[PDB]
Amino acid sequence: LDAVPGVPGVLTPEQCRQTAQAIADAQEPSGALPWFEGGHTDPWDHVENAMALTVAGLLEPARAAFDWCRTTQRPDGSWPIQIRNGVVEDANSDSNFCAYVATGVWHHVLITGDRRFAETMWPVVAKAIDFVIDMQLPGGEIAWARSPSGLYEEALLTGCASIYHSIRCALALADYMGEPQPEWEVAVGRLGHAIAEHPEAFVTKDRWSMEWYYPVLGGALRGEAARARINRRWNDFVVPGLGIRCVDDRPWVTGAETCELVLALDAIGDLTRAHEQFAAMHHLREEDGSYWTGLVYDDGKRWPIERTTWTGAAMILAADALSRTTPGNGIFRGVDLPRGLEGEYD
Ligand SMILES: [Mg+2]
Ligand code: NI
């Protein structure tokens, strides 16, 4: 508009803005961006929503959301897994959820150039990434969760792939701030090595599409290895004309997973298939610009029966990447992100 993403024939800039406005309309007075009005909030989707608001130019609600991150961050640097209208429902810490604030903050700095925002959020990001690295296991993978009684010492490939990208975003912010973080550089290098070379470190979750594309989306796997991985499961997940399955054994396509795959395809230059998959998930779009979570494609039922802010948010981020509209559009492509210390693995 002309600053708002659009994809001709698929998504107008007006439609992109409308989806972002539906996210903003769900914001709680605290700044939380929940799944939907009356639903719960989780930190990862909260940040995802704030990134989409930034892309669409709704900077006021986006800043209120980042303020919520700052004001609710707990003493150890974490956020609870689940809150509902300010009532904590799951007080454990999910390492993936806590790290993602780094991505959202760096994305916001890329788009706005707002150094005062960077200075305000830098201690938030630093405390969060320090907390996440304190969950790293000896092999380099990250424990998926922490509770008051200790770490859950299983690692999830999707979460680790997301954290890998989040820490690289934290390192980009560290450079912007002029405050080197050698410990983060070591940690992210060891994490990337585990993702790439130690499959035995992660719980086996082969049926989930996110486990298939997240190593590519997060940048742990690129080039020939990434192209091979995408092609390896393509037909298990991609449903012609409809997007992609959340799990390989249910006739159920989901908008967010489709749009995350779009970002992964864009990252490896597969713009032909990125555009095809992006175009194929807009049957989930509702009249107010919000998106249904998913479709049971062999009977026509939406499932779950919910329109989720973060499905529209994922769509917006994919639209920005395809159109290369805002200065944050390439944050997953990651051309300029630091790599950390690639070596000395233990
Ligand atoms: Mg809280
Ligand atoms: Ni190794």
Author numbering: 6 to 351
Sentences from the paper on this structure:
Mycobacteria synthesize intracellular polymethylated polysaccharides (PMPS) of 6-O-methylglucose (MGLP) and of 3-O-methylmannose (MMP), both proposed to sequester and protect newly formed fatty-acyl CoA chains in the cytoplasm, thus modulating fatty acid (FA) metabolism and indirectly the lipidic cell envelope. MMP is composed of a linear chain of 11 to 14 units of α-(1→4)-linked 3-O-methyl-D-mannose (3-O-MeMan), blocked in the reducing end by a methyl aglycon, and with an unmethylated mannose at the nonreducing end. Using a combination of MMP purification and chemoenzymatic syntheses of intermediates, we identified the biosynthetic mechanism of MMP, relying on two enzymes that we characterized biochemically and structurally: a previously undescribed α–endomannosidase that hydrolyses MMP into defined-sized mannoligosaccharides that prime the elongation of new daughter MMP chains by a rare α-(1→4)-mannosyltransferase. In this elegant mechanism, MmpH serves as the recycling enzyme that hydrolyses mature MMP into defined-size smaller oligomannosides that are, in turn, substrates for ManT and MeT1 activities for further processing into new daughter MMP chains.
The three-dimensional structure of MmpH was determined at 1.35 Å resolution from monoclinic (space group P21) crystals. Although there are two MmpH molecules in the asymmetric unit of the crystals, the enzyme behaves as a monomer in solution, as suggested both by size exclusion chromatography and DLS analysis, and underscored by assessment of the protein contacts in the crystal using PISA26. MmpH is globular and mostly α-helical, with a diameter of approximately 45 Å. Thirteen α-helices (αA-αM) are arranged into two concentric layers to form an (α/α)6-barrel. At the center of the (α/α)6-barrel there is a deep cavity, opening to the exterior at one of the ends of the barrel. The catalytic base (Glu628 in G1d and Glu393 in CpGH125) seems to be conserved in MmpH (Glu262), as is the network of solvent molecules coordinated to these residues and that participate in the inverting reaction mechanism. In agreement, replacing Glu262 of MmpH with an alanine residue completely abolished its activity. The drastic reduction of activity observed for both Asp47Ala and Asp50Ala MmpH variants is compatible with one of these residues being the catalytic acid. Interestingly, in MmpH the volume corresponding to those residues is part of its large depression and could accommodate an additional sugar moiety, in line with its endo-mannosidase activity and in contrast with the exo-mannosidase properties of GH125 family members.
